[PDB]
């Protein structure tokens, strides 16, 4: 999308692996605000928004929390309490045409700054102090939007860059988007410390003979002693017995 027409999206309700990204591309710009990039895959979020667009080369510095500029102050602004991050990878193999790719623009003129995550599309003719040159040209009757016009002769400072911005939420979050898992391969018949999908205990695991109903995950004897569990991987029922102990 264009700088002023970013494609908002939400990505929630998923086991999000934030390390599948790293196999994509060289990831020219990858720095995270409000959350560490290393500790992304594990942490959980309310709703993850993604805004994708293309800018010029020497304007990639303007996409940052609380940073003022001409693409940041005019057509795309992200909060100061921002949680998420921005990812930019130069893409002029599909974006720069011989002659000028007049498809990506940037608000150069406006009235004031915009609020964070404020997207505007209006393409009216900007004023001229007095009543403007509605639908015409003249002394200084200058449209607010201006095209980048990428060509394969522009310097690297004037080349197009594709960019995705993820906005997380951590306030009141119904954990829906994050990546834990990692199922330590199963061991049987040894008193072992186990953590089955959150149920933690110790004991020897043995092949079960009891039919858990399909919506059931636990087994208890009298006095709430957790007696059995079904595998969250193979859904097999296993019996738990406390490893041997006694007096001497």
């Amino acid at each position, epitope marked *: 999308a264009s700088v002023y027409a970013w494609n908002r999206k939400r990505i929630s309700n998923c086991v999000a692996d934030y390390s599948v990204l790293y196999n994509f591309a060289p990831f020219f710009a990858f720095k995270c605000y409000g959350v560490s990039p290393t500790k992304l895959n594990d942490l959980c979020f309310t709703n993850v928004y993604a805004d994708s667009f293309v800018i010029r080369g020497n304007e990639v510095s303007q996409i940052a929390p609380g940073q003022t500029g001409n693409i940041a102050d005019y057509n795309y602004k992200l909060p100061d309490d921002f949680t998420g991050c921005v990812i930019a990878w130069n893409s*002029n*193999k*599909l*974006d*720069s*045409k*011989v*002659g000028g790719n007049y*498809n990506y623009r940037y608000r150069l003129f406006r009235k004031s700054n915009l609020k964070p995550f404020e997207r505007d599309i209006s393409t009216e003719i900007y004023q001229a102090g007095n009543k403007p040159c509605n639908g015409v040209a003249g002394v200084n009757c200058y449209f607010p939007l201006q095209s980048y016009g990428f060509r*394969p*002769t522009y310097g690297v400072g004037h080349q197009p860059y594709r960019v995705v911005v993820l906005s997380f939420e951590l306030l009141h979050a119904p954990a829906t988007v994050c990546g834990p898992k990692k199922s330590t391969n199963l061991v049987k018949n040894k008193c072992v410390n186990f953590n089955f999908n959150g149920l933690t205990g110790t004991g020897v695991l043995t092949e079960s003979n009891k039919k858990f109903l399909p919506f059931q995950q636990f087994g208890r004897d009298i006095a709430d002693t957790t007696d059995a569990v079904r595998d969250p991987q193979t859904l097999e029922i296993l019996d738990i017995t406390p490893c041997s102990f006694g007096g001497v």
Partner: antibody
Amino acid sequence: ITLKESGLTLVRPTQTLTLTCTFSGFSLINSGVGVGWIRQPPGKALEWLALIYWDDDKRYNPSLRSRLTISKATSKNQVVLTMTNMDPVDTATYYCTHRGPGHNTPIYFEFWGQGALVTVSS
Amino acid sequence: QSVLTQSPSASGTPGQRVTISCSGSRSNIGSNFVYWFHQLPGTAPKLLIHSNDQRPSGVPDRFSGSNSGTSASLAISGLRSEDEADYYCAAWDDSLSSWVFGGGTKLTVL
């Protein structure tokens, strides 16, 4: 990746040439990809006619504008070229070629067709 | 100004290095990328070098390109017998706003 032109190879003067580039291996809906046309007279140097990017950028050869119309049918994976007012000077071979992305610059003319010798006579 | 010029003949001999020139103007060769194709008699050309220094997958190493100011050069090493064919320039002309090509060279080894 392959492209191939087809159409009428013989046409009277004051008539129209139609050509169809049927391809395989790419789609004119992704970014970068575009398709162009290049003619070469019998015994002359190459010459550029027109080009059409993936975002519908109908570039034309200026000196050859007001005569050419190129269009795409991506659903059918085919491109159509049309040229009115054919003349004996347009006897040439016409290739349909492909322009995609590279590694640091868009690629242009990486793949060519195989030609269709077109004679305009009686 | 709006048309690229190449020498028609190279005329090497096996195992030698030769250069092929291409002269343009401020508007085509001096402000855009210069391509270099290869065309055999009775067959469509085949890309050899785009962007003045990059090779499409499937072209041997011996071809190198160079752009300098308002001039262009193609350098052929290890001249062999399977290369006698046409060699073309290519460039986008902002003043004409169109692609322009050169004449072509035979390059028949002796």
